[PDB]
Every structure is written in C-alpha cells, then in structure tokens.
C-alpha cells in the first residue's frame, strides 16, 4: 500500500514527540470535553447530601474528604484546560476560603453551553462579549438580594447560628456541636479595633474517644515532656529564651590554655561556680518556669532542679513565637536575669495525659487571651483530618463576616433569582449577543439541579416549582432537603444563608476562567519528559 508522506512547511520542521492542534474541531471542542469531564468528576460531592470520596496519592497516603480543593490538589491532572480550571478554584480558595466547587460547576456549565452556541453558528467573540455583559449585569443585580446583615459578631449565640450553614455541608449531622465549638474559639480572640487573624486558632489532634469529647482551651498544649523533676505550677512567671540553656562561648575558635597545675585544678570549679551564680540570679527574679529553644546542659538542669524551676524545651522557632504571644513574654537571646516587662504570666502550667499521649498545658483563667486551641478526639486519623478541614472552613467564614456583614439566601434561591432576572434583561437586547446572555442565565440552574440530584429527587419538578413560586414574588424560597417528595421552603426563616463576598468572587472567577479557556485557538505542546 501507499502512504501519505507529510505536508511541506511547518509539519516537516516540527520536532519528534511534539504536538500541534489547530482550529475549532481539534482545539476548542476537545478543551470543552476535558473541562466537562473534570466538572463531572467532582459534581457528586456538592451540598449537605454529597458523598465522601477516597483518594490515594503517589506516596500511598490516604485521603477521605468532601472538600473540592483538596480533591483537586490530590489528583494528578494533565490536560491544560483542566489545569486552568484547577488554578481558578485554588485562587478562589485562597481569596475567600469557601466555594471552590461552585467555580467548577459554573465553569463547566458555561463551556458546555458555549459548545452548542458555537455549533449553531455564533462566533467566539460574540459568545465572549455576551458573557461579559451578563456577568456585569449579574454583579449589578446581586446587592439587591441581600437580607439579614449580621448584627453583633461578639455574641456567642448569634455567631453559632451564622456559622452553622458553612459546616452543615461538610459534617451533616454534627453541625450544632462543631458550630458552637468554633464560635467559642473565634469569639475568644477577636480583638477590639482588630483585624481578626486566622493563624491565632490552633488545632491539636489526639487519638481516643468519639468526636463529642472534643473541647476548646484558652491557651496552649504541646505534645512534649518536662525536662526537670518539677511537673506543675499554680501561678507561673515565665522566662523565654531563644538560646541554649548552657554556658555560652566565643564564635571564633577558642581553647583553654593552661601553664601550671593550679589552673588545671581550678578550671572546673570556676565553671561550676559561674553556672550556679547565673542560675541563682535568674531564679531570684521570681521566675518559676523557663522555656528555651535549644539544648539544656546537665549542670544547668541540675541547678534548675536545685532551685525548683520548671524547665521545658521546644524546637520549632514558630511555636516559641506563638507561646510568646500567648503569655505576653518577650524572647531573649542572652542568658541574663530578665526584667519585669519581659515576664510572661500564666494561671496554670502542668503535665497531663490524654489517651496515651503526654502533653504540657499552658492554661489561662481568662476568657479572651491572645490565642486559643481546639482539642479534637476521634477513632481514626482521617476523621480528625476531615473535622480539621471543617474547622478551617468555619474560621474562614467568621473572617469573611468580619470583612463584610451582608448575607444572601442559600439553597438555590439566589441562583434562581439571578437566572430569572438575567433572562428578563436578555429578552430586551436586540442583536446576536442575546443568545449568549440567555445561556448565561441557564448556566445558573446547574447549582439547584446538582443539589436535587444529590438529594435523590427529580430536579425538573424542583426547578419548575422554584420558578413558579419566584414568579409570585418570593425571593427567599429554595430547595427543601428533609422532604422525600420534591418541595420548597423559605430559606430566610430556616436560617440557610451564605456570604455576599463568596458569591461575588465565585461568579467573577468562574466567568474569567471560562472566557480565558474560550480564547485559546491553537495549541503547541512539547514532548513530556
């Protein structure tokens, strides 16, 4: 038989292993297919009824999770368009901290509809301009849907109710307990005239009993042991050092040079006397506990035991700073008797044991403090990891509420209203860009549908009833999860809400990613290495 040799020009100068795709049929449609596959991968984990997923990475580590960002991080994607979608989702996670699945669902829907718009006859530029016009209109419409702005962010009973919705979709069936725990921990440290910093909430995981035995502590817990023979204090003055608890020496090489016998006899006694004087001078200021970030010498430990000083060491360079913030102490690079202003104060310091784990606890009787800790108890490491992820989501929700106080209804009410008003706007646009606009509105129906598909009901009836009830003027009506037959419910009365800022950023980033993917026309790929 015969062969089709090659085409002259660029096809003959291309290296071996490289690829070149050009045109709509070889570039655009294949990208749309890849994005659709990526969206279908994570669609099933949306909402309170979304099911858990289990992933094993290339190092044989195990993840059991519902969060979309973690799932995308643990997978190994190869197609560039899916990489753009993943990067958009990660940017949304970094900017806000919740709503990394709305991005994927919306972008997939937008590209899926753009495929048929291109099939019918429209050009890519018109689709793009319609999408931008619709996005601007949606951002204009959104502020009018806001209801129930947050009133007081230092009231425990209101904060507990505001954070319940963000955790219900991760730990359905345990939302009240975790919500109350996170509310206490967050209300503890919010400072007046204060930026709320997220770092100041710490999580400690100890294997043991069920989740319901978890607790919150106003202070710190370290998984360490005491170096000395004193074990507890009842009123602690704390001195913190970043240098080793030992006799300090020259930076340049130094040798002890002796010429007579008497110096040889007296050297060790001189060193011991100096070390004793230093320890006694430190102790005379009233410090009961010394915390260091380096080595402790044997003689220094012996003299600390002589004068009843609790000695703890930890080597992280970051736990030391956080402890200094917790107790109000200032680190010292020298081994000198500290001044009163550099004293830390703690109500209790003690060594305890929880379920085979030995810990050292710095505990305050104060209600505010500077940082706080959450102690989690579970029967499996994966469960505690999932609970930690839920805690992070709740804390980020509190931070966003600090930034902006406005809430919008959830459960699909906002998306239905946006789609209705965008369709109404698009019916009055004369030109070819109206079709694109209408498609944009239809892309908002993928959010309620998914919910219904996860709840085990028929999405078409739910969407029809939502449209029918929104035609009458009820803007706060969404899907009812408890019912086994399709139904609708008032979300404002039932307290299902979500932040304005999250929805704003989600819409923006999803539209940006979809348009960026649509703009690419031809692809040149090097050979994988």
């Amino acid at each position: 038989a015969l062969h089709v040799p090659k085409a002259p020009g660029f096809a003959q100068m291309l290296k071996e292993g490289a690829k070149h795709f050009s045109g709509l049929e070889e570039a655009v449609y294949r990208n749309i297919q890849a994005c659709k596959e990526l969206a279908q991968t994570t669609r099933t984990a949306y909402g309170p009824n979304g099911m858990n997923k289990m992933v094993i990475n290339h190092l044989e580590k195990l993840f059991v999770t519902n969060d979309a960002a973690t799932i995308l991080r643990e997978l190994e994607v190869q197609h560039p368009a899916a990489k753009m979608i993943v990067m958009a989702s990660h940017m949304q996670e970094q900017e806000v901290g919740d709503g990394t699945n709305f991005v994927l669902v919306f972008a997939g829907a937008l590209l899926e509809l753009a495929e048929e718009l291109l099939r019918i006859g429209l050009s890519v530029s018109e689709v793009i301009e319609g999408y931008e016009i619709a996005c601007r209109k949606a951002h204009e419409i959104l502020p009018n849907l806001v209801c129930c702005s947050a009133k007081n962010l230092r009231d425990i009973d209101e904060v507990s109710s505001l954070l319940r919705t963000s955790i219900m979709s991760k730990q359905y069936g345990n939302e009240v307990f975790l919500a109350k725990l996170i509310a206490q921990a967050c209300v503890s440290i919010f400072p007046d005239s204060g930026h709320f910093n997220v770092d100041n909430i710490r999580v400690c995981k100890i294997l043991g009993s069920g989740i319901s035995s978890s607790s919150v502590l106003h202070g710190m817990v370290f998984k360490k042991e005491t170096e000395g023979d004193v074990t507890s204090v009842k009123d602690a003055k704390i001195a913190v050092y970043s240098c080793p608890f030992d006799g300090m020496i020259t930076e340049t090489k130094g040798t002890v040079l002796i010429k007579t016998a008497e110096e040889l006899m007296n050297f060790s006694k001189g060193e011991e006397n100096l070390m004793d004087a230093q320890v006694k001078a430190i102790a005379d200021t009233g410090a009961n506990v010394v915390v260091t970030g380096g080595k402790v010498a044997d003689m220094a430990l012996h003299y600390a035991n002589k004068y009843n000083i609790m000695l703890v060491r930890l080597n992280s360079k970051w736990d030391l700073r956080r402890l200094c913030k917790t107790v109000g102490a200032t680190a010292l690079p020298r081994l000198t008797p500290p001044v009163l202003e550099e004293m830390g104060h703690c109500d209790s310091v003690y060594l305890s044991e929880v379920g085979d784990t030995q810990v050292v606890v710095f505990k305050h009787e104060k209600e505010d403090g500077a940082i706080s800790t959450i102690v989690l108890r579970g029967s499996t490491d994966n469960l505690m990891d999932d609970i930690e992820r839920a805690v992070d989501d709740g804390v980020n929700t509190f931070k966003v509420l600090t930034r902006d106080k406005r809430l919008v209804p959830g459960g699909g009410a906002t998306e239905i209203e946006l789609a209705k008003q965008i369709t109404s706007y698009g019916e009055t646009c004369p030109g070819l860009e109206q079709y694109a606009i209408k498609k944009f509105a239809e892309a908002f129906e993928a959010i309620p549908r998914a919910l219904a598909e996860n709840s085990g009901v028929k999405a078409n009836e739910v969407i029809s009833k939502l449209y029918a009830v929104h035609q009458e003027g009820n803007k706060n009506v969404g899907l009812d999860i408890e019912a086994e037959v399709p139904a609708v419910k008032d979300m404002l009365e039932a307290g299902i809400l979500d932040t304005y800022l999250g929805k704003y950023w989600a819409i923006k980033l999803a539209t940006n990613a979809a348009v960026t993917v649509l703009r690419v026309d031809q692809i040149i790929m090097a050979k994988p290495a």
Partner: protein, 521 residues
C-alpha cells in the same frame, strides 16, 4: 482521546459495586481474628520476612502484624489501635461489632437505599445504647477500703481469663493490684518495670516493692568488694569517675620538667579529690549513668564499698523514686538529704544472670516485676497479658462502675433497641432492628469457640431477658446460661461505651464513601 484528563494508570471505581466490595473486605479482616475471643480462644503465630516469629492472642497485635493494604480495611485496624490506646482491653469485640454492623445492612444497600438514612439510624441507635449503658451500670458510692480492692481483683481476674496465664490468674491478679496501689496520683506506666529472665516456672515470678536491675559491665576488682548490706546509703550520680582529659578544648604548654611532674600529679589529685568527697559522705553504694574506671573500682573495693556504672536512665530514675534521693551532677555538696536509704541491698543469681536488688523501702512509689518462663515468646506473651490487667485496674480506680460480662449487656441492649424500634415507623424501624440484631455476635462467638449449640443458648437467653434477668450470660464450664453478676464476671462500662462509639464511627465512615481513585505508584 488525543490528550487524556488524568495520568495513565489511574484506577477508579464507583457505585454500589465498590461499596459492596468494601463490605466484603471488612468481613475478611474480621475473620482474621474471629476465633480468639473468650475463655476458649486460641492464638495465632505470625512470621515476618526476616524469619522471626511471634505468637499472640491480642487482637491489636495480630492486626498490626498483618500487612493490610485495602483502604476500606485499614479502618478496622485504626479503630483497634484507638481502642488499645484509650482503654487497653476489648480490641477484638470492636472489630466483630463493626463487621456485623456492615454485614447486617449490606442487603439494604443492595436494594438501592440512600446511605444517609443508614447513617442517621446508626447514630440514633448508638446514642440510645450508650445512654442505656450509663443508666443501668452498678456503682457504690462509699464502698469500703476492702470492698474497693476486691472489685479491682475481680476486674483483673476477668481480664486475664482468656490469656496464656489463665490457670494462675488468682496468683497474678493480686500482684497487679498491689502494683497499682503504689503508683501515686498520676499512675505513670514508666514507674512499673518489667524484667524477663529465661528459665523457671510461671509460679516463680515475683514482685519486689523496691527496685532491681541487671548487672553492668565491670572492670578488675569488682569481685573483691562486699555484696550484701543492711542499712546502706545510696549515692546517685551523673558524673564520669575515671582518669581522663579535663576538656576536649584543653591544651598544655610547659617549659620545665618539674612543672611536667606537677601536671602529671594534678590529674591524680583531681580524681582522688572526687573519690574522697564521695567517700566522706557515708555512702556505701554508688550508681552512675556514666562510666566508672578501674582505678575508682579498686579504690572503692579497698574501702568496702559497691559501685556500678552505665546504669540505664530509667532504672536510675526508678531507684530515685523508690529510695528517695536526687541525681547529682557534681560532688561538691553531698548532703544527707540527697542520699537514698534502703533496708537490704543484695546481688543474687537468677537463672544464669546476676541481679541487683534494693528492697525494704516503705516509702516507695514503685514496684518491679520479675517474670520466669521457658522461651522468649512465652515471657513476651506473659507481659502482653499483664499489660491489659494493669490498664484495666488504672481505669477502674478513677470511675468505678461495673457491668456483667459474658454477653449479658449485649443482650440487654439488643432487647432495649428492639423494643424501641417497634414504636417508630418507616425504614428507621428496619434499620434499628438490624442494629439490634447485630449486637448478638458476641455470645454467638463465645458459644461457637467453646463448642456448644449457639441457637439453643441464644433462644434461652432471649426468653430469659424478655421475661422478668438483667445480668444473664453464658456459663462456659456448665455449658448453659447463668447469672454473670453473681458468678463474678465484671468489667468497667468504659470498655463497652468506647467499643460501641468506635465501631459505629467506623461503620458510618465506611458507608458514606462513594468512589475510590488510585494514582500511579
């Protein structure tokens, strides 16, 4: 198809089949340790790649030594480890419970039922069961000073009934109780030393209210110094006593031979200064974590004293706690308040080895075990058996509530849940019924391991519990049913509470997984 989404070699499974496969794998995991439960339970032998073998009856150990790689099966290993960490006993009941929970609801999963209904039913049932256990447990407020030891002895005897040392349980239980009546208020497990010496009978094991430890490496002259004292004073040290360089940074420059001789004499003068400072304090036994030279050995031998070097740190801390001194890193102030005091010190021959014994201290917060066996795995299994009793005694000292064993509490909870299920309508009724029926795998396994007819015994137990017999379980020796609260089969309620919570958590976690993805390598 030209460019694929994920990397080549990624394996994905989803739907009902993968959930059914996970449930199937959990059954194999539970079968691995199924026949090790009860007074008539066997034990397993596992061999690793190098050739060493290990013989065990403890469930957590067997699960650890199995190289399980199935992601759904690893959860049962994790819950067993957690149960071992928290309470220390009951690491096989939880595994069978979890497997039975999965197996009883497998058929409903096959029919197409939403797993969240199953999860809700499991959570409700677990809450009800834990509340019932807390309600019906027996406790005594001001029991006694003697009725508070008998309860711990019964708990230990029950905890030892299925181990290799069962026949001598009455001999061992007593000892372990004493062991935990001296451990202060923190009850540190490092305060109890376990020593294993080959050769001897199991009835030759002993407990010393004091301390004992092995002989260390010794230089010449150790055999010329006394080996028994009656009221000695002990010096505990952290100082290296031998002729050596003062410091690694040191350097000596000298110009005359007279100063050379003086420098030579200086080192001997320093060492002898330390030795005289030790001697003049009145101590007769000296111990140090750091080496002792031969010169020091002969110096101590010439003055009728005893010395030891390179003592392990744990043993030295244990000696401090038993005798009541303090570790000294310097010899410039050896007062009377920093020395120990015992009532007898001796060095004795124990089956091919030499052991140092400090006994006769009534102020001791420490005890030490000496175990006598015939092969390495024998003493290892003896120690593993004693650990369960130690942990049970510690847990029983704080919270003192007791429930009856043998399966009485399982059948009581099953009856309660079945009576509750008939009240509520819907699929919740069937799911609570399945949960109630899954609780009687413990008495069935006891009867099966013993070699009885389980159906007849289960029918009699169900009839006895439905009528009225709260504490009725299986009598293994008489091959029948009997009251297990008057036969003294007692166990703390924490074991059952933790087992139920852990098993329910594992079942709920396994049921809620939709699909599995494996990445290459």
């Amino acid at each position: 198809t030209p460019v694929i989404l994920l990397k080549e070699g990624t394996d994905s499974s989803q739907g009902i089949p993968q959930l059914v496969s996970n449930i199937s794998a959990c059954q194999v995991i539970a079968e691995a340790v199924r026949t090790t439960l009860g007074p008539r339970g066997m034990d397993k032998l596992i061999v690793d790649g190098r050739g060493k073998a290990t013989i065990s009856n403890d469930g957590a150990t067997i699960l650890k030594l199995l190289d399980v790689v199935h992601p759904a099966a690893k959860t049962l290993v994790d819950i067993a480890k957690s149960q071992d960490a928290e309470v220390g006993d009951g690491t096989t009941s939880v595994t069978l419970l979890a497997a039975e929970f999965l197996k009883q609801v497998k058929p409903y999963v096959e029919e197409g039922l939403h797993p969240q209904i199953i999860i809700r039913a499991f959570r409700t049932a677990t809450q009800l069961a834990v509340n019932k256990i807390k309600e019906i447990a027996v406790t005594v407020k001001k029991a006694d000073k003697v009725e508070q030891r008998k309860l711990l002895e019964k708990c230990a005897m029950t905890a030892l009934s299925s181990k290799l040392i069962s026949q001598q349980k009455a001999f061992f239980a007593k000892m372990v109780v004493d062991a935990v009546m001296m451990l202060d208020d923190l009850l540190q497990l490092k305060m109890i030393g376990i020593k294993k010496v080959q050769g001897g009978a199991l009835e030759d094991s002993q407990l010393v209210a004091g301390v004992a430890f092995k002989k260390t490496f010794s230089y010449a002259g150790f055999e010329m110094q006394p080996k028994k004292y009656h009221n000695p004073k002990i010096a505990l040290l952290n100082v290296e006593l031998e002729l050596k360089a003062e410091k690694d940074n040191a350097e000596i420059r000298v110009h005359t031979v007279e100063d050379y001789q003086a420098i030579v004499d200086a080192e001997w003068n320093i060492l002898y200064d330390k030795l005289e400072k030790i001697h003049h304090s009145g101590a007769k036994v000296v111990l140090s974590k750091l080496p002792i030279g031969d010169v020091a050995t002969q110096y101590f031998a010439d003055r009728d004293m005893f010395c030891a070097g390179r003592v392990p740190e744990e043993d030295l801390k244990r000696t401090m706690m038993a005798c009541g001194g303090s570790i000294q890193t310097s010899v410039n102030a050896l007062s009377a308040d920093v020395l120990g005091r015992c009532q007898v010190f001796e060095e004795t021959q124990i089956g091919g080895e030499r052991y140092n014994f400090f006994t006769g201290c009534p102020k001791a917060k420490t005890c030490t075990f000496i175990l006598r066996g015939g092969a390495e795995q024998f003493m290892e299994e003896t120690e593993r058996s004693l650990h369960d009793a130690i942990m049970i005694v510690r847990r029983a000292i704080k919270n003192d509530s007791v429930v009856a064993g043998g399966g009485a509490i399982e059948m009581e909870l099953s009856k309660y849940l079945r009576d509750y299920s008939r009240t509520i309508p819907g699929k919740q009724q069937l799911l609570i019924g399945a949960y109630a029926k899954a609780l009687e795998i413990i008495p069935r396994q006891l009867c099966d391991n013993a070699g009885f007819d389980a159906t007849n015994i289960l029918n009699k137990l169900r009839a006895r519990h439905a009528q009225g017999g709260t504490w009725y379980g299986v009598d293994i020796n008489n091959e029948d049913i009997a009251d297990n609260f008057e036969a003294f089969v007692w166990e703390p309620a924490m074991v059952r509470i933790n087992a139920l919570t852990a098993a329910s958590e594992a079942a709920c976690l396994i049921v809620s997984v939709d699909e599995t993805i494996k990445n290459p390598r």
